[PDB]
Amino acid sequence: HMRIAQVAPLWERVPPPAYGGVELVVSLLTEELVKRGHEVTLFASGDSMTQAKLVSTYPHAIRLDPNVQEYAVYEALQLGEVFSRANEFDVIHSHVGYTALPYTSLVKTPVVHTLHGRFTADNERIFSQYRNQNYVSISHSQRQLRELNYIATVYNAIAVETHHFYPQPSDPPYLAFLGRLSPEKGPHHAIEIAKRVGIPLRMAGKVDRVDRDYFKELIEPHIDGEFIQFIGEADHPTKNALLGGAIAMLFPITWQEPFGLVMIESMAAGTPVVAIAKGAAPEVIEHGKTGFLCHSVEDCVAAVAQVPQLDRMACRDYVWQRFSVERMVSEYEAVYDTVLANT
Amino acid sequence: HMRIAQVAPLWERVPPPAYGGVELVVSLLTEELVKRGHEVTLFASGDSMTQAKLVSTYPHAIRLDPNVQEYAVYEALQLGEVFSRANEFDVIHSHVGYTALPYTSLVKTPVVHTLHGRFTADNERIFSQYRNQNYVSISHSQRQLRELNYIATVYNAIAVETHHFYPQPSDPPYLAFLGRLSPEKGPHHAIEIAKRVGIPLRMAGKVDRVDRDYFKELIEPHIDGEFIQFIGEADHPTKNALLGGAIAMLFPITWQEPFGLVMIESMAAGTPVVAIAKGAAPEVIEHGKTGFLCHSVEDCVAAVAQVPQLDRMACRDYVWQRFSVERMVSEYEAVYDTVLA
Ligand SMILES: OC[C@H]1O[C@@](CO)(O[C@H]2O[C@H](CO)[C@@H](O)[C@H](O)[C@H]2O[C@H]2O[C@H](CO)[C@@H](O)[C@H](O)[C@H]2O[C@H]2O[C@H](CO)[C@@H](O)[C@H](O)[C@H]2O)[C@@H](O)[C@@H]1O
Ligand SMILES: OC[C@H]1O[C@@](CO)(O[C@H]2O[C@H](CO)[C@@H](O)[C@H](O)[C@H]2O[C@H]2O[C@H](CO)[C@@H](O)[C@H](O)[C@H]2O[C@H]2O[C@H](CO)[C@@H](O)[C@H](O)[C@H]2O)[C@@H](O)[C@@H]1O
Numbered sequence A: 001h002m003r004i005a006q007v008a009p010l011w012e013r014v015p016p017p018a019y020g021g022v023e024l025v026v027s028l029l030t031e032e033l034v035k036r037g038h039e040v041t042l043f044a045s046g047d048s049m050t051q052a053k054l055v056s057t058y059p060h061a062i063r064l065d066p067n068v069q070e071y072a073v074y075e076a077l078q079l080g081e082v083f084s085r086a087n088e089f090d091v092i093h094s095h096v097g098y099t100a101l102p103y104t105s106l107v108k109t110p111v112v113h114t115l116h117g118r119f120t121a122d123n124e125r126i127f128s129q130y131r132n133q134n135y136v137s138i139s140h141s142q143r144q145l146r147e148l149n150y151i152a153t154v155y156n157a158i159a160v161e162t163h164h165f166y167p168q169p170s171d172p173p174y175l176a177f178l179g180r181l182s183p184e185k186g187p188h189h190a191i192e193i194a195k196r197v198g199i200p201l202r203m204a205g206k207v208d209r210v211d212r213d214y215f216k217e218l219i220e221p222h223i224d225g226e227f228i229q230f231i232g233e234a235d236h237p238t239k240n241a242l243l244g245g246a247i248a249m250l251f252p253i254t255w256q257e258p259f260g261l262v263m264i265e266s267m268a269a270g271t272p273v274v275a276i277a278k279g280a281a282p283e284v285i286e287h288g289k290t291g292f293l294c295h296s297v298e299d300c301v302a303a304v305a306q307v308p309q310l311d312r313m314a315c316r317d318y319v320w321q322r323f324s325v326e327r328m329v330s331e332y333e334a335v336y337d338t339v340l341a342n343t
Numbered sequence B: 001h002m003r004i005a006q007v008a009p010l011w012e013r014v015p016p017p018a019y020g021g022v023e024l025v026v027s028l029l030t031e032e033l034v035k036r037g038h039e040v041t042l043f044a045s046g047d048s049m050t051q052a053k054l055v056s057t058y059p060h061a062i063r064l065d066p067n068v069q070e071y072a073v074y075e076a077l078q079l080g081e082v083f084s085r086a087n088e089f090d091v092i093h094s095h096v097g098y099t100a101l102p103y104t105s106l107v108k109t110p111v112v113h114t115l116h117g118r119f120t121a122d123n124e125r126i127f128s129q130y131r132n133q134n135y136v137s138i139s140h141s142q143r144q145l146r147e148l149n150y151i152a153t154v155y156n157a158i159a160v161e162t163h164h165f166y167p168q169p170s171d172p173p174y175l176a177f178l179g180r181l182s183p184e185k186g187p188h189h190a191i192e193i194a195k196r197v198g199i200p201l202r203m204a205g206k207v208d209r210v211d212r213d214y215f216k217e218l219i220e221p222h223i224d225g226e227f228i229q230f231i232g233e234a235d236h237p238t239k240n241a242l243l244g245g246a247i248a249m250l251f252p253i254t255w256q257e258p259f260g261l262v263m264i265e266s267m268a269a270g271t272p273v274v275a276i277a278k279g280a281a282p283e284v285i286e287h288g289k290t291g292f293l294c295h296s297v298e299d300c301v302a303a304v305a306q307v308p309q310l311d312r313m314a315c316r317d318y319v320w321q322r323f324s325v326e327r328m329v330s331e332y333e334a335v336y337d338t339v340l341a
């Protein structure tokens, strides 16, 4: 019974064929919001696929589009389209970060900001000046600016039914890395863990413009093609066979992870996660059940020997209980009611 | 009789100590408007030097600041500052490009956009949706979108009096390159021109992040230290001694130049410019009088033999005639009167 605007980043298609975290959450939230009888307008790339109304300022995803050199041009276009149509919505749900804060004070329509990212020394200055705005975090450890007006915590979710469940891992063992080849994800840790335990590592993910040197210096020289394998950017079927076949997924972040969708994607396939207890990993993994929280590489190596002790169906059942779209969208519906009443 | 907001980019100090084109133009325009009794508010870095009211969202210039990795935070910060107080000005004069267009439709106060940059395959799309807004070009050749509502063309200007005049170049001749070490300025062309004529080249400019590969593999291996010299970003006194001592300044652009402040800075020093005729070079150089418009490297080499044929004092007077702060500011004042009615 609401008019809702979903403003997505333009780097990826809202249902992204391969890499894409924020866009994927926007997809799940938007489709379920439409099923619940709301009039939803989605602001996203032109190739996006939604049953809501799609208003786009570019036909394709920006990251892998070769004709685009200035992402900010189309980012500003869609920001101008949204807030200049502010009277056609009851609430604006923005997912594009701080670039929407200076527009929010200029329109009557209340705006909800879902924080999808780490806090940095720079962005804290702009969030501080707009402290009295409606923010929603995706984990508790993310709230490093305890002066912002946090309306609620809404954990992210995946579509568990669309992930195939694997009862037992592949017959010759192998570990899995899934994610962008970034130091923040620590694929260098994953490679070192693999031959310390003697178990091969299969990796999937993109190597985008900012990590080419890092991949070039620390990741590429270790890729055998046999013990260390790199398939590159994987689509949904590819990553599901990647995670499902592994005894465990290595998540050795060196970073203040806000959430980590690949963790709940690994558990949905029935594969537990060996992660480092940074960021939101303690809130996502139940230690000694759906994975192991570790505080060093040697802890991760010691934990890999204890991953067959886990019940794999409990991993999938865990994802159903906490990270389903049903719960997430219902929690976002509770946010919209709060913002539209406590104005 | 106006309250005017000057919105500057944050990469450089509004009076930039060294590199900085757009920021320098905002400085001259802002100070002169304050002299003429306009109540000016300048939005810029905190170390800027102005007689207007200064509102800053970061204390220093970001480009050489090592603590900043996200320029967009402070750019968005000051954009929010302007339009949250947009009700306090009669005219907003933006110099920050397309990032301010979506704000213009949200406020009553009219906004004038001075275009400081080339048109691109991407940025044309955002200017197109905001075609009916108040734009000002800094050259006519820059108007590659003949559908925009250009209020006027206002050529840029420098403070000619602050540039020392050189009657005669340095005793052993040398040519000069001044500008960012970018392929858009073609310093590789300048080096090739340099030993084609028998005259050494002293070069000045910044080498920023996007051109390090260009500099490392195309420029740096040729820096002799004797025939080719690179002084590495010059401040105002050094760069003017660089131009004044040269027989001519090489301006070998490969690019749709919006203006080119180093040209009128070179002529102000009394040094004529041998440039290639792309972008605004025909409108800035008077061919055969204060320099030579060329269409190849070939031509630039031929022009170096005919630069003593030019009168150096006429070059300084030329900048006084066309690119003075007095003329530019009055035309921008006519734009403000135009936009306010
Ligand atoms: O300066 C902060 C610091 O953190 C990064 C990522 O480590 O910034 C990310 O966080 C916010 C919002 O998530 C945005 O400012 C950035 O866009 C985002 O990083 C994206 O850009 C880098 C490349 O610079 C990519 O590798 C990441 O994959 C991007 O992550 C987000 O963007 C995509 C597309 O929207 C989403 O699918 C993804 O879920 C997001 O996490 C760094 O930029 C920076 O070092
Ligand atoms: O796709 C556009 C293409 O062209 C550049 C210039 O090479 O873009 C410039 O034009 C607009 C507005 O001027 C902006 O997109 C850019 O900010 C501007 O280029 C600046 O950034 C590059 C680094 O990529 C620098 O070398 C230039 O020095 C910058 O040029 C302007 O910015 C400074 C400070 O704001 C001014 O002092 C200067 O006078 C301006 O020319 C490319 O950036 C882009 O790739």
Ligand SMILES: O=c1ccn([C@@H]2O[C@H](COP(=O)(O)OP(=O)(O)O)[C@@H](O)[C@H]2O)c(=O)[nH]1
Pocket: A017, A018, A019, A020, A021, A022, A024, A178, A179, A180, A204, A205, A206, A232, A233, A234, A235, A236, A239, A259, A260, A261, A262, A263, A265
């Ligand atoms: O090769 C890849 C690498 C990543 N992803 C997906 O992109 C999303 C990344 O979200 P995450 O939070 O885990 O990483 P981040 O956004 O922080 O870079 C996840 O849904 C991944 O399944 C993918 O499909 N293929």
Ligand SMILES: O=c1ccn([C@@H]2O[C@H](COP(=O)(O)OP(=O)(O)O)[C@@H](O)[C@H]2O)c(=O)[nH]1
Pocket: B017, B018, B019, B020, B021, B022, B024, B178, B179, B180, B204, B205, B206, B232, B233, B234, B235, B236, B239, B259, B260, B261, B262, B263, B265
């Ligand atoms: O070492 C340098 C190199 C450049 N500049 C100044 O930076 C400005 C650049 O303006 P221009 O239009 O010529 O180049 P662009 O802005 O287009 O890159 C000029 O005023 C130069 O005098 C400088 O002070 N020192």
